[PDB]
Amino acid sequence: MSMILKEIRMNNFKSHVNSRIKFEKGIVAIIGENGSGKSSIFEAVFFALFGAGNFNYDTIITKGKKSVYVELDFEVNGNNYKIIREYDSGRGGAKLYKNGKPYATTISAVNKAVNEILGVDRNMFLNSIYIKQGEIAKFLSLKPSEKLETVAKLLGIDEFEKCYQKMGEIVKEYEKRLERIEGELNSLKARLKEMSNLEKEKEKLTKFVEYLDKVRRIFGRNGFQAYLREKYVPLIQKYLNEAFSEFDLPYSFVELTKDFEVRVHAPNGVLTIDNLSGGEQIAVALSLRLAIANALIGNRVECIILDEPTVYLDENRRAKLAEIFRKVKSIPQMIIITHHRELEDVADVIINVKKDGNVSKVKING
Amino acid sequence: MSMILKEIRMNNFKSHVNSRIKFEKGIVAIIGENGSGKSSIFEAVFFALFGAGSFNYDTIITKGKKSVYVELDFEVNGNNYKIIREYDSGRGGAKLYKNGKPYATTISAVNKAVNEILGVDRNMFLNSIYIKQGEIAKFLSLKPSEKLETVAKLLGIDEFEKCYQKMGEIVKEYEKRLERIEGELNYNLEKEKEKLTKFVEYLDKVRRIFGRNGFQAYLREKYVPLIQKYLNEAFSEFDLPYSFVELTKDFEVRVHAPNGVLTIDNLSGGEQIAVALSLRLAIANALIGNRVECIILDEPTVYLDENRRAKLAEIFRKVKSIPQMIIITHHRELEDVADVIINVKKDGNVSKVKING
Numbered sequence A: 001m002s003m004i005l006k007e008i009r010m011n012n013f014k015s016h017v018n019s020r021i022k023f024e025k026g027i028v029a030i031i032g033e034n035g036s037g038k039s040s041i042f043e044a045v046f047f048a049l050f051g052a053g054n055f056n057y058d059t060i061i062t063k064g065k066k067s068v069y070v071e072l073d074f075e076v077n078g079n080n081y082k083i084i085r086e087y088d089s090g091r092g093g094a095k096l097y098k099n100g101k102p103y104a105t106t107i108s109a110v111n112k113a114v115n116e117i118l119g120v121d122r123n124m125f126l127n128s129i130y131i132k133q134g135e136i137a138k139f140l141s142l143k144p145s146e147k148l149e150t151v152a153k154l155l156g157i158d159e160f161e162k163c164y165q166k167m168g169e170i171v172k173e174y175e176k177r178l179e180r181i182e183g184e185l186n187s188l189k190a191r192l193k194e195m196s197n198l199e200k201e202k203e204k205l206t207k208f209v210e211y212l213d214k215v216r217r218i219f220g221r222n223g224f225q226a227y228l229r230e231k232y233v234p235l236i237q238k239y240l241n242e243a244f245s246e247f248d249l250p251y252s253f254v255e256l257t258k259d260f261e262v263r264v265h266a267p268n269g270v271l272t273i274d275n276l277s278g279g280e281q282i283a284v285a286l287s288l289r290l291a292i293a294n295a296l297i298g299n300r301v302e303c304i305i306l307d308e309p310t311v312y313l314d315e316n317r318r319a320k321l322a323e324i325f326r327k328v329k330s331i332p333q334m335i336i337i338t339h340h341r342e343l344e345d346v347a348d349v350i351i352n353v354k355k356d357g358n359v360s361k362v363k364i365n366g
Numbered sequence B: 001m002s003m004i005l006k007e008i009r010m011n012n013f014k015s016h017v018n019s020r021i022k023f024e025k026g027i028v029a030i031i032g033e034n035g036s037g038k039s040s041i042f043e044a045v046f047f048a049l050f051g052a053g054s055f056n057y058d059t060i061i062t063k064g065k066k067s068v069y070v071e072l073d074f075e076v077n078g079n080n081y082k083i084i085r086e087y088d089s090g091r092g093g094a095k096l097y098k099n100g101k102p103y104a105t106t107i108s109a110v111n112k113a114v115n116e117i118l119g120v121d122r123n124m125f126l127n128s129i130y131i132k133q134g135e136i137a138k139f140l141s142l143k144p145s146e147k148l149e150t151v152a153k154l155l156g157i158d159e160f161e162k163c164y165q166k167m168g169e170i171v172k173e174y175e176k177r178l179e180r181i182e183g184e185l186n187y188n189l190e191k192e193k194e195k196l197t198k199f200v201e202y203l204d205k206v207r208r209i210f211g212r213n214g215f216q217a218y219l220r221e222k223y224v225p226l227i228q229k230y231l232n233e234a235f236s237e238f239d240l241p242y243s244f245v246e247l248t249k250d251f252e253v254r255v256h257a258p259n260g261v262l263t264i265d266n267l268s269g270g271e272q273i274a275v276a277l278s279l280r281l282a283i284a285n286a287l288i289g290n291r292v293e294c295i296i297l298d299e300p301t302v303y304l305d306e307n308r309r310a311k312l313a314e315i316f317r318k319v320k321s322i323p324q325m326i327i328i329t330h331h332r333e334l335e336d337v338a339d340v341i342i343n344v345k346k347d348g349n350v351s352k353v354k355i356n357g
C-alpha cells in the first residue's frame, strides 16, 4: 500500500528549527540552494513514519537543542493519518491518529501500527517512495550487467543471498565440528559417558546440517529468490509498458527478463537501454525505476519522491528529463527536490527552501 | 585472515580533500583535535576495502566536490595489495593489484576478490580490526546482562537474527501462495503446492531449532574456545596475576585466582580495564581464526576517569603481540605510548596530516 503525503511540521530537526511544509498532489518541486535543508524535510518525514531504529538523536536534533518534534499528516487508502513522534531530553514518545481519532499511543504500538498499515518493512517502503540523488544518472552509467544488479538490490534479492551465505557459515561450522567429533570418536567411566555423548552430538549435528542445507537452498538463487523474480518481473513489465506509452516512447513492447534485463523490442532489433539514445535512455531509466517502486508495494505508487533527479546529467539531458517530467500523469504526487530553478516550470506547486544562517526557511511561490 | 595496514591516499573524502597517511607497525597514535578528521581516515580505509555498502556518495564526497578517490595499500599473508576505489559524477570504478600486478578490475570482481582474501564478510572483518569509541567503557559499566549480550552482538548474532525474520516472512509468503493454490484447486501444477508446503516445513524446522537462542548456541560452539584461548594469551602478555581464565558458555569471564574463581566485577579496577581489552582483543582473534595483525582502537580512552586513562595508557605499553596497534585520540599524553605519531589538524574544513614525535 502506497501513501500520499499531505503535510509535515517540524521542530528542531537539523536545520529546521521551526518549519511547516504542506504538500499537494500533482508535481511538487522543492527548490533551494545546496545545503539549504531540502533533504532534511524528508528524513523527518521518514523519521515520523518509523522513528528511531539503535540510532542517535544527536543526528536529528538541532545543534544547541535537546529536543526534536516531527508531526506528519499522510494518507493511506483514503484514510487520513496524523503521526507524531517526539524526543525530549531522553524521554521518547509517539502517537498515531486515524481520521481524527486516536489509534496508537505508544512508540511500540505506533511502529507496529505503521507497519500494519503500509504493508512493508522500512526499506521496502523507502525504496517504493524515495529515489536517491542522481540515481537515474548513476544507472545509465552502470555497465549493462550492473543495471541488472541494482534492480535485484532494489527488489531485496541480495537480501536473501546474504542469508544464503550466513546459513552457509553455520553449515560449515557444523561440518568441521562433525570432523572434530568423528576424530574424537576414534576416569574410564567418564571417558565412556563422553564417548556416548560425542555420538549423541554427532546425531544432533548431522540432523541440523541437513535442515540448514534445505533452508539454505530456499534463501538461494533458485529458492525464494527465483520466486521473487517470478513475482516481480511480470508486474515490472506491465508498468514498463504503461510508462512507454506515457512518456511516449516509439516502442509497442518492452520486456523484462528474469535476470531483470530491460529488452526493448524495436523494428530491427531487441536492444538494451545502452543501445538507446540519451534522451530515450533517460526515459526508460525513469520508467524502470518507477516500475520497481510499483512492484515493491503491489499496486501503483501514490507518492514518489525524486531527490535531485538531474544531478550528473549534462545540460541537454537535464532538459530531456525535465520534459519527461511534464508527461507524468499516472503518479498522483511526484515530489522533485533540486537546486535547478528551471525545473519549477514543470511543477504545479513549488516550495522554496533557503538556509538563513543555519536555520532553514520555507516559502511557497511560483 | 588479518591484514596489516600500510598506506592510504585520499581525495575529496569528507574533510580530507588531499591527504596521504602512511602507517607503520608497532604502536601508531593518531592524535588530533575532536572533529579534526581522524575517524574519516579509517572510514576511507574501509571504503577502499568494500566500497559503497548497499549507501550515499553524498556522505563521503567533500562538500562542494563531486568526486572522491581512495587508494589503500595493505598486506594480507605477506602479499602486498593496493586497492583503488573511485567515484566520479555517477561513474563508479574499482581495481585491485597484488604484488604490483593487476588482480581485479571491476567493482564486482574487486569486492569478490577482497572477500575471497580476507575470509569474512564486511562486519565480521570490521569487528576484528576496529574497536569503536566506547566499546571498552561499555565493558566496565554495563550490567552482567548487557555484557554477555553485547559480546554475542560482536560475534554477529544480529545478522543471524535478520535471516530469522526472513525465514518467517518467507513462510508467510509461501503460505499466501499456498492459499491462492487451494483457491484455484477448488473454485498439473499442484506440484508447486508440494514444493511450497515442503519448504514451509524445512523453514519451520530451522525456525524453531534456532529460535531466540538458536544462534546463541551456534555462536558458543564456534568462538568460545577461541575467545578463551586468546583471552588467556592476553592475560599473560598483560602480566595479569592469574594462571588461567575461563569463559562460561554464556560469554562471562571466570578468572581463576588462588581463592577460587574470580568474577570481573570483583577484580582490581586497573585489571578491570586490562581484562576488558583482553576480552575484546580476544574476540577479534576469534572472529578471524588467528592472531590479529592490525587492531584499531578509536578513542579507547573516552569515558574513563583521569586515573583509568593512565592505567590503560600503561597497559598499551605492554602490547607486543599485536604487530600494528593504531590508537586514535585527542589526548596528547598517549603520544608517549607510540612508536609513530600522526598528527591530524583541521584547517578550516580541510584536514591536514603531519608526522611528528
Ligand SMILES: Nc1ncnc2c1ncn2[C@@H]1O[C@H](COP(=O)(O)OP(=O)(O)O)[C@@H](O)[C@H]1O
Pocket: A013, A014, A015, A016, A032, A033, A034, A035, A036, A037, A038, A039, A040, A041, A058, A059, A060, A061, A062, A063, A358
Ligand atoms: N544536527 C543538525 N543540527 C542543525 N543543523 C544541521 C544538523 N545536521 C545538519 N544540519 C544542517 O543541514 C544542512 C544539510 O541539510 P540537507 O537537508 O542535507 O540539505 P539539502 O538537501 O538542501 O542539500 C547542512 O547545511 C547543515 O548545516
Ligand SMILES: Nc1ncnc2c1ncn2[C@@H]1O[C@H](COP(=O)(O)OP(=O)(O)O)[C@@H](O)[C@H]1O
Pocket: B013, B014, B015, B032, B033, B034, B035, B036, B037, B038, B039, B040, B041, B058, B059, B060, B061, B062, B063, B349
Ligand atoms: N562530506 C563531508 N565533506 C566535508 N567535510 C565533512 C564531511 N563529512 C564530515 N565532514 C567534517 O569532518 C569532521 C568530522 O571528521 P572526523 O574525521 O569524523 O573527525 P574526528 O574523527 O577527528 O572526530 C566534521 O568536523 C565535519 O565537519
Ligand SMILES: [Mg+2]
Pocket: A038, A039, A307, A308, A337
Ligand atoms: Mg539534497
Ligand SMILES: [Mg+2]
Pocket: B038, B039, B298, B299
Ligand atoms: Mg573520532
